[PDB]
Amino acid sequence: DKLKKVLDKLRLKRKDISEAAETVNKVVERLLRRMQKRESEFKGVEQLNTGSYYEHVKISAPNEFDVMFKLEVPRIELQEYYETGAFYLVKFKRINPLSHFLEGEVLSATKMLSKFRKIIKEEVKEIKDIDVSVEKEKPGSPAVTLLIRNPEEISVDIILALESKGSWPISTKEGLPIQGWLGTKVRTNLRREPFYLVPKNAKDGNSFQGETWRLSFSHTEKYILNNHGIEKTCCESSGAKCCRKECLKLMKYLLEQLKKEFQELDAFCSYHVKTAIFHMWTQDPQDSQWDPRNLSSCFDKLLAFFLECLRTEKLDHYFIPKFNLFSQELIDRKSKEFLSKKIEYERNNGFPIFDK
Amino acid sequence: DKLKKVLDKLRLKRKDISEAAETVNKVVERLLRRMQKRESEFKGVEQLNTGSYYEHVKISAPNEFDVMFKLEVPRIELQEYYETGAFYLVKFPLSHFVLSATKMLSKFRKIIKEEVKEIKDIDVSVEKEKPGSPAVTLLIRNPEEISVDIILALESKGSWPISTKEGLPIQGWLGTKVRTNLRREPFYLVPKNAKDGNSFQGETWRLSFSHTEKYILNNHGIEKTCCESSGAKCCRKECLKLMKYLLEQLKKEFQELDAFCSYHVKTAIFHMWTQDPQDSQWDPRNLSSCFDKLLAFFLECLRTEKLDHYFIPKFNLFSQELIDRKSKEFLSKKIEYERNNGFPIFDK
DNA sequence: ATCTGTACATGTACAGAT
DNA sequence: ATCTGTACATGTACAGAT
DNA sequence: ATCTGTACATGTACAGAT
DNA sequence: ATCTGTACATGTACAGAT
Ligand SMILES: Nc1ncnc2c1ncn2[C@@H]1O[C@H](COP(=O)(O)OP(=O)(O)OP(=O)(O)O)[C@@H](O)[C@H]1O
Ligand SMILES: Nc1ncnc2c1ncn2[C@@H]1O[C@H](COP(=O)(O)OP(=O)(O)OP(=O)(O)O)[C@@H](O)[C@H]1O
Ligand SMILES: [Mn+2]
Ligand SMILES: [Mn+2]
Ligand SMILES: [Mn+2]
Ligand SMILES: [Mn+2]
Ligand SMILES: [Zn+2]
Ligand SMILES: [Zn+2]
């Protein structure tokens, strides 16, 4: 009940969806068209809509959209970066529009993102009917973020991605453990889909900085979010409703509200909660462990699980098991203890941050 | 217990499967080769394996195989023939054939018979034509008898015909998403060439959904993991095997049952699977109850003379027009007898 | 004349609105 | 409950190119 | 336009364990 | 008797090479 009313506050309004999507699609369509001009290295690039808005778990307002501009790259050869499992160098053994980004067979990610960025910036400059500008580059982002003032503020991340149709890198062999939940045929079919590489684009001063790419499974996450049940009819017009997505929304909202107040939580991001709930859905595969009538305890058990991840410094990437998103290397112990105490506080005082 | 030991004798043998498949594959591949590489009206025909063997519900022996040679055709007007639902005339390479099914099947048939004449490493002949069958049937012996149906099919990529709009009622079982996607696949047309002497029979085709039925057979649970290595086994397929066996044994013994076929059993269990969607209603521990409710369902179909095509709901496979009342009363008696006496026919 | 990248045309699951 | 906008998968038309 | 290579589904067969 | 784990077998989707 208390959580039904939060979900009501979190629910997007069709009026807002409608106006936000009309502008967002106008801009994206025009950027996609510019990428296909004859002399553009990005000709043939294709659009893939991803992220919470297209998974139907975007909360509060429709003000942040994510879209991949993906470019098929055949004859690709990968070299894992330092056994990290998620980061790779991308080699061409064959010698191509991607000429100008090569560095002796090694494909520079920052060179290709820069040219991509400049093209977008020019196309945005020629837009005169909507108030849209290109956000200052953020280190660690693979995105070119548009800031739209459809009066209200809207963010669109244009994510540059390489598309490889070969089999997935062996670092994922043990990843995606959906056999007991969505099953082996789903897993086999999912792993026949392409995998994606986006720029790491850190400026950490480490070797190979501007040539490191990072695996992306947004496409696979979108499928899972929209086909999330062990029963084929879960949340369908002739099936039973589950509360899997509602739990994701509540958890997203807890992290959003806290991050809004506390800059101690800057290392945390919504993908951490998304990852945590993929493990909980794997742990509790049956749709009856996500009955809408048990939203309270379903939310509670996800918090307990997240808390255990924080305290034990262990949140395995769902697709790359050997990659710990909560290792010391990425997030301070003190950053994790701070969030634990804040989560424990909300959990045991009626979630006062939901009332803000 | 009794039903387990029957399923054990119905189970195909891994060696028998290997020897028959490599010979069937030899013949089918050579036939397929001739239809395009040699420039004929069917250049571009593609192979689709169908039916009980490829659905893994073949019983007793790997002695019968069904293959579609499907051919893509665009802008084919589907005029439904006098509300039958399943039968259509086809209008607008294939210049030499209204697209007459009889004229196109006969050339198809002629090509296969020439190729079979040129096969010298396998004992294989072409069965004499059966009016009413869309198949070119091959008889192989190595030395075991194997029969292969080569089914000519037209492939259309448009919306399914309107007579199917209420068909395939899987929404509460496999769901709306599975259904929407299945109906995005092509649909197929195969020859009807009866000798009933009725009106437009020569130029008619019949809808085929063997591709959809294969998917269902192999994606038959309400849970995505049913019958997978990390899910629970159900007994849906074993019930189909048991009802197929009961009919096959009854048909061998009674000529009165010549108008029944295994596709009747297949259709009835599709309705049962829809009536009883939950995998737990097909637990292996309830094999007996499950088989019995299928029997009772099949008997109610006979009693009401009503067995709708799973994809074409206005097409009654049990209409008087197709099976006499007495044939259905006869079958009701034989099934009721086997049922009420522990199935003596299963022990022979 | 035919070919074909682009974009319209069709259908419906999802979920907000009433 | 029904009505209804967006997203998206796949079929098809055709201005402009060959 | 054709065909092999790959991965893992669907099966059968059976020893050891329960 | 069933369950489990390994071996053995064929069928099928599709990437990539020719
Ligand atoms: N650190 C990351 N590692 C891997 N994939 C990520 C990461 N951050 C984001 N992604 C991918 O990019 C998508 C979009 O990122 P974003 O941060 O917008 O979150 P979201 O899932 O869309 O949710 P929200 O924007 O509502 O907070 C994610 O859904 C995920 O697929
Ligand atoms: N009357 C029919 N109407 C529609 N489709 C049919 C009909 N008869 C057969 N088929 C299709 O053709 C396939 C081959 O039919 P066939 O008679 O060989 O039986 P089967 O299902 O393969 O089983 P079995 O041969 O083991 O008895 C069927 O599985 C079905 O898809
Ligand atoms: Mn987002
Ligand atoms: Mn984003
Ligand atoms: Mn058959
Ligand atoms: Mn047959
Ligand atoms: Zn659900
Ligand atoms: Zn099953």
- DSSP line for B162-177: GGGTT----TTTT-HH
**Domain extents in chain B:** 2-12+160-186+209-348, 13-159+187-208
- Phi and psi torsions of A186, nearest 5°: -55, -50
Return d(Cα A124, Cα A30) in angstroms, integer.
9
Question: What is the C-alpha separation between B214 and B208, in angstroms, rounded?
Answer: 12
Assess whether B185 (CB) lies less than 7 A from strand C. no
Tell me chain A's radius of gyration from C-alpha atoms. 21
> Hey, are the CB atoms on A231 and B225 less than 8 Å from each other?
no
- Output the distance from A213 CA to F5 C1' rounded to whole Å: 40
Among the bound ligands, the one closest to the CA of A59: 1
**B133 CA to middle of ligand 6, Å?**
9
Q: Which residues of A touch B222 (CB under 8 A)?
A: 231-233
Task: Work out the number of other CB atoms within 10 angstroms of the CB of residue A4.
Answer: 10
Interface test with A, best of B224, B226, B280, B281 (most A CBs within 10 A): B224
The 8-class DSSP code of residue B144 comes to S
B223 CA to D3 C1' in angstroms comes to: 31
Q: Which of A330, A76, A104, A106 is closest to A208 using CA atoms? A: A106
Whether the beta carbon of A218 falls within 7 A of nucleic chain F: the reply is no
- CB under 5 Å of ion ligand 8: residues: B 221, 226-227, 234
The Cα B116–Cα A69 span in angstroms is 53
Can you tell me whether residue B151 is helix, strand or coil?
A: strand
CA pair distance B27, A138, nearest whole angstrom: 63
> Which residues does residue A133 pair with via DSSP β-bridges, in sequence order?
A147
Q: Which residues, 6+ apart, have CB-to-CB distance to B51 below 8 Å?
A: B64, B65, B66, B149, B210
CA A222, C1' C11: Å apart? 22
Residue closest by Cα to atom 5 of ligand 1: A216
Q: Which residues contact A231 (CB under 8 A, 6 or more apart)?
A: A239, A240, A287, B222, B223, B224
The residue nearest atom 3 of ligand 1, judged by CA position, is A271
Alpha carbon distance B153, B304 (integer Å):
33
Mutation to probe ligand 1, out of A12, A50, A52 (largest number of atoms < 8 A from CB)? A52
Specify the resolution in Å.
2.5
**Spatial distance between the Cα atoms of A48 and B68, rounded to a whole number of angstroms:** 36
Ligand positioned closest to the Cα atom of A58: 1
Residues of chain B with a CB closer than 8 angstroms to some CB in chain A: 171-178, 219, 221-225, 228-231
For atom 4 of ligand 2, the residue with the nearest CA is: B208
H/E run at residue A22: helix A14-34
| Cα diameter, chain B | 59
* Nucleotides in chain F near protein beta carbons (<7 Å): 1-3, 8-17
Residue B72 and residue B38 in contact, taking contact as beta carbons nearer than 8 Å:
no
Instruction: Render B68-127 in DSSP notation, one character per residue.
Output: EEEEE--S-EEEESTT-SSEEEEE--GGG--B-HHHHHHHHHHHHHHHHHT--SSEEEEP
Pairing of strands B205-208, A87-92: unpaired
Mutate to test the interface with B, among A178, A186, A188, A233 (most CBs of B within 10 A): A233
Three-class secondary structure assignment of B222-284: CECCCCCCCCCCCCHHHHHHHHHHHHHHHHHHCHHHCCCCHHHHHHHHHHHHHHCCCHHHHCH
The radius of gyration of chain B's CA atoms, rounded to the nearest angstrom, is: 21
The one-letter code for the residue type at B96 is H
Distance of alpha carbon B56 from the chain centroid: 13
Instruction: At A255, list the tokens.
Output: 């992290």
Do residue A182 and residue B219 have CB atoms under 8 angstroms apart?
A: no
Query: CA of B202 to nearest chain A CA: how many angstroms apart?
Result: 42
Of residues A279, A246, A278, A263, the one with CA closest to residue A339: A263
Q: Is the dihedral of CA A221, A223, A226, A228 positive or negative?
A: negative
Q: Decide: residue A191, CB within 10 A, 0-12 exposed, 13-18 middle, 19+ buried.
A: middle
Closest CA to ligand 2's atom 8: B263
Which of B10, B11, B17, B52 to probe ligand 2 with, by most ligand atoms within 8 A of CB?
Answer: B52
Cβ atoms of A238 and A205 within 8 Å: the answer is: no
**Determined by which method?**
X-ray
CB–CB contact A236 B176 (8 Å): yes
Rounded CA gap, A77 and A93, in Å?
A: 7
Helix pair angle (A333-347, A244-261), 10° resolution: 120
Residues 6+ apart with CB under 8 A from A104: none
Among all chains, which residue has been given the structure tokens 């424990």? A344
| Token code pair at residue A353 | 């941050």
Statement: the CB of B237 is under 7 Å from strand E: yes
CA at A74, C1' at C5: how many angstroms apart? 21
Residue whose CA lies nearest to ligand 1 atom number 29: A51
Q: At what angle do helices B2-10 and B287-303 cross, to 10 degrees?
A: 80
Q: Are strands B123-126 and B135-141 parallel, antiparallel or unpaired?
A: antiparallel
* Inter-helix orientation angle A295-312/A244-261, to 10°: 50
| Other CB atoms within 10 Å distance of the CB of residue A155 | 15
Tell me which residues have their CB closer than 6 angstroms to ligand 2. B 50-52, 58, 64, 66, 208, 210, 213, 261-263, 266
A51 lines ligand 1 (CB under 6 A): yes
d(CA B157, CA A75) in angstroms, rounded, equals 33
Q: A105 forms bridges with which residues in the sheet?
A: none
Alpha-carbon span B78 to B83, nearest angstrom: 12
**C-alpha B9 – ligand 6 centre gap (Å):** 22
Element (H, E) at A27: helix A14-34
How far is the alpha carbon of A43 from chain B, nearest alpha carbon, in Å?
Answer: 30
User: For helices B236-253 and B262-275, what crossing angle results, to 10°?
Assistant: 150
Helical residues (DSSP H) of A82-136, grouped into ranges: 109-125
**Closest to A242 measured CA to CA, from A292, A206, A197, A172:** A292
Residue closest to A72 by CA, chosen among A47, A105, A101, A103: A47
Exposure of A331 in the CB half-sphere (CA atoms within 13 A): 23
Place of tokens 């709306």: B176
